[PDB]
Amino acid sequence: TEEQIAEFKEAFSLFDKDGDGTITTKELGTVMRSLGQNPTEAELQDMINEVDADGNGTIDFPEFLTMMARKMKDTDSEEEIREAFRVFDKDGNGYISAAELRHVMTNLGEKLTDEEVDEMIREADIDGDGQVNYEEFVQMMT
């Protein structure tokens, strides 16, 4: 929803007391304690680490959407990698062929040669079927 998001940026701004675009443990604890909870500092750090995709100890708005989605960061990252994968998997069959890779990359401004493309598919083609599936796409990227 679009207004579910607008609600969420409202929430984020409230929690981000000082407006610097990040939520700290202290800001998080203030909110938790205002709702009748007594989380330890370790527990507050844990809440943050669970969505802390960039590893900087604070929550920004994109990581907060993970938290509002309630999710863990690996789950969230998997859903984002799958969205990138579907950009390349034009026919939607679950495999990035060499032609799909060449086509999408060209239309995104990167034209590689034919044998660059064939080697990119080869490199990430673990099981040797000639195409790049999702798990191979994840691996390729790490």
Residues at the binding site for Ca(2+) are 16, 18, 20, 22, 27, 52, 54, 56, 58, 63, 89, 91, 93, 95, 100, 125, 127, 129, 131, 136
29 binds, among Ca ion, Zn ion, ligand J6P, none (CB under 5 to 8 A by kind): none
Q: Are 50 and 41 in contact (CB under 8 A)?
A: no
Contacts of 56 (CB under 8 A, 6+ apart): none
- Contact between 67 and ligand J6P by CB under 6 A: the answer reads no
- We find the least distance from the C-beta atom of residue 62 to ligand J6P, in angstroms, to be 16
- Contact between 76 and Ca ion by CB under 5 A: the answer reads no
- We find the least distance from the C-beta atom of residue 115 to ligand J6P, in angstroms, to be 13
